[PDB]
Design a protein around this ligand. Structure first.
Ligand code: AMP
Length: 355
C-alpha cells in the first residue's frame, strides 16, 4: 500500500500519491505537493509527527482533524484524505493529511500589484471564510498572510482553524509566536478579545496588500504599541482609563499622537484611479480600512458589517449555494482533558474513521 520518499524528512504515503516535492514549512513540519494518480488531481500532503506526544499538540491536532472533516466551505481548505502507515494503535506514530493544493500563500500576493477587482475579491473570500468560522463558534485569532492560500484564478482559502481559547498551565503550554504583526492591540493591552479580533487582522492584511509592506512591524510589545499609535493616534482618554493600572499608566505616559488621516496613510495614488469607477472604489477601500484598523474593539466594524460594505458586497452572489453550518459531533471539543495515552487513541480512532 505504501512507499517511503525523503523530502527533508521521510514521508511514508499511499502509492496513489506520487512525485512528492516540498511547497512550504511550518510548525508541523514539511508540506508537500503530490499527484494523486487515483483522482487525477494535484494535492497537498502534510505530515503530523507523533502529534499525541504532549497534551498541547495532541489537543491542537485532534481539533484540526475533527474540524477539517466537519467543515465544508469554499474559503476553508478542504481535507481530501487522512491516513496512517502504521498498522496498530500501539505502533501508531504519524498522521498524514491530504488537502486540496493551492498555488501560493498571501505573502506572494503582496508584491503582485493587484487592482480593485482582485483585491476586493480576495477580501470578500477572506471575510466569507471568517464568517463561517464565527458561525461555527470559532474565533480564529491568528490570521496572517502565511496561513491564507490562493490559486492563480484568485480563489482563496483559510488554511487552519486558528487558536482555541485555552488557559495556560504548567502542562497545557503555549507555542512561542514568531509573527505578531497581525494581532489586535487589545491582547497586548490586557483587555481580552472578542470575535472582531479577526477584523483587525484582515485590516492589517488588506493594508499590506495595498501598500506592499507590513503595516505594524514591531519587534516586541512595546515597539508594536508605538507603531500602532504613531499611525492611528493615541486612543481616547476613556479607552485608556478603562485599562488595568500598570498598562493604563504606561499608555497614558506615552507621547501623544494625532494619528495620520487615512487619506494620507492610504493616498489615492497608491490605488488604481484610471476610471470614475476606480475613484469610487478607492474611497470605498479607504473607508473600509478606516473601520477595520481601529484600536478600540467596541468601535471596530464586525465581520457581518464588513461583508455588507460597498467595497466588498459587489461580490455577493445570491444564486450561489450557501454552505451549511458544520455539525461538530464532538461537543466537548475545548473541554477535553486527557492523558497522552487517551489522546493517542482518540486521534487514532479519528484517523481510522476515515478508512
Ligand atoms: N494546501 C496548501 N496548498 C498550498 N500551499 C500550502 C498548503 N498548505 C500549506 N501550504 C504552504 O505551506 C506553508 C506552511 O504551511 P502551514 O505550516 O501548514 O501553515 C504555507 O504558508 C503555504 O505556503
Amino acid at each position: 500500500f505504501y512507499s517511503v520518499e525523503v523530502a527533508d524528512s521521510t514521508f511514508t504515503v499511499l502509492k496513489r500519491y506520487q512525485q512528492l516535492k516540498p511547497i512550504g514549512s511550518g510548525a508541523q513540519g514539511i508540506v508537500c505537493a503530490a499527484f494523486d494518480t487515483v483522482l487525477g488531481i494535484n494535492v497537498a500532503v502534510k505530515k503530523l509527527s507523533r502529534p499525541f506526544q504532549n497534551q498541547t499538540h495532541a489537543k491542537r491536532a485532534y481539533r484540526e482533524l475533527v474540524l477539517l472533516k466537519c467543515v465544508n466551505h469554499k474559503n476553508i481548505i478542504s481535507l481530501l484524505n487522512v491516513f496512517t502507515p502504521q498498522k496498530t494503535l500501539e505502533e501508531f506514530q504519524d498522521v498524514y493529511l491530504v488537502m486540496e493544493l493551492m498555488d501560493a500563500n498571501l505573502c506572494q500576493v503582496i508584491h503582485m500589484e493587484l487592482d480593485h477587482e482582485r483585491m476586493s475579491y480576495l477580501l470578500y473570500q477572506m471575510l466569507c471564510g471568517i464568517k463561517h468560522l464565527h458561525s461555527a463558534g470559532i474565533i480564529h485569532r491568528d490570521l496572517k498572510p502565511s496561513n491564507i492560500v490562493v490559486k492563480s484564478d484568485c480563489t482563496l482559502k483559510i488554511l487552519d482553524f486558528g487558536l482555541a481559547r485555552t488557559a495556560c498551565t504548567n502542562f497545557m503550554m503555549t507555542p512561542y509566536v514568531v509573527t505578531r504583526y497581525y494581532r489586535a492591540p487589545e491582547v497586548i493591552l490586557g483587555m481580552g478579545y472578542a470575535a472582531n479580533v479577526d477584523i483587525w487582522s484582515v485590516g492589517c492584511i488588506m493594508g499590506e496588500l495595498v501598500k506592499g509592506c507590513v503595516i505594524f512591524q514591531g519587534t516586541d510589545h512595546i515597539d508594536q504599541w508605538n507603531k500602532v499609535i504613531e499611525q492611528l493616534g493615541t486612543p481616547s482618554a476613556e479607552f485608556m482609563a478603562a485599562l488595568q493600572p500598570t498598562v493604563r499608566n504606561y499608555v497614558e505616559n506615552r507621547p501623544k499622537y494625532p494619528g495620520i488621516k487615512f487619506e494620507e496613510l492610504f493616498p489615492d495614488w497608491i490605488f488604481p484611479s484610471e476610471s470614475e469607477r476606480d475613484k469610487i472604489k478607492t474611497s470605498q477601500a479607504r473607508d473600509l480600512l478606516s473601520k477595520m484598523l481601529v484600536i478600540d474593539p467596541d468601535k471596530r466594524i464586525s465581520v457581518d458589517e464588513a461583508l455588507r460594505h460597498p467595497y466588498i458586497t459587489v461580490w455577493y452572489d445570491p444564486a450561489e449555494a450557501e454552505a451549511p453550518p458544520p455539525q461538530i459531533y464532538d461537543a466537548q471539543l475545548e473541554e477535553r482533558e486527557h492523558a497522552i495515552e487517551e489522546w493517542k487513541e482518540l486521534i487514532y480512532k479519528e484517523v481510522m474513521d476515515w478508512e
